[PDB]
């Protein structure tokens, strides 16, 4: 367990970060939030290997109701993408891809920043 | 609170205005001092 913020706002912040990282496959953040969203998104790639309806009814909670995506002028929803695409790369592997890179600090707040990716 | 000096024009271009002063003896004297002393403004 770990605290960035209050209860609610933390949670929604994590549905947000984890909603991203798949839209973009990597982001730049402070280290702490990357650790927590790592745990989450690890659990979601563990989910999207199974692929049952119920699995969608568990990825529904955390991930958002929609966030549109276009690669080839295509319509996706960050859910179709997950169970349809992502896990189909890392089936032969366990969950637990995500890696972290202690990039550098930040002039404003002195906070360490990183580049967490699933690529 | 509502502090003193809730401002307004009419009560300030009245009382402290000119035509009051230059319609009263004492006020004429007042102006005499604010002239003798030199000032860039009167009735204020």
């Amino acid at each position: 367990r770990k605290l960035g913020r209050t209860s609610d706002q933390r949670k929604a912040m994590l549905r947000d970060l984890a909603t991203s990282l798949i839209i973009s496959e990597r982001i730049e953040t402070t280290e702490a939030r990357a650790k927590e969203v790592r745990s989450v998104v690890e659990k979601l790639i563990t989910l999207g290997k199974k692929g049952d309806l119920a699995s969608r009814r568990n990825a529904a909670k955390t991930l958002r109701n929609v966030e549109i995506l276009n690669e080839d002028e295509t319509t996706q929803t960050a859910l179709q993408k997950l169970f349809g695409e992502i896990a189909e790369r890392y089936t032969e592997r366990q969950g637990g891809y995500t890696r972290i890179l202690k990039q550098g600090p930040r002039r404003g707040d002195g906070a360490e920043s990183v580049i967490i990716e699933l690529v | 609170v509502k502090r003193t000096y809730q401002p307004n024009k009419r009560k300030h271009s009245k009382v402290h205005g000119f035509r009051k002063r230059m319609s009263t003896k004492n006020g004429r004297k007042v102006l005499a001092r604010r002239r003798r002393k030199g000032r860039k403004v009167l009735s204020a």
């Binding site: 730049e28 890179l101 202690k102 990039q103 550098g104 580049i115 | -």
Partner: protein
Amino acid sequence: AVPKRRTSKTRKNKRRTHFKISVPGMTECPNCGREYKLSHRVCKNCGSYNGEEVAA
């Protein structure tokens, strides 16, 4: 609440034997030929933590 006395030029300095700051970790790059800080990224050229895995 308050001081009663003037803090002299000595104690004001002895008190400041600890506002120094530490020599940060450093090492040359493995194939970017320059210095950076440990268990971190280079910020240059192509990123070199074990070699390039990034652009920025």
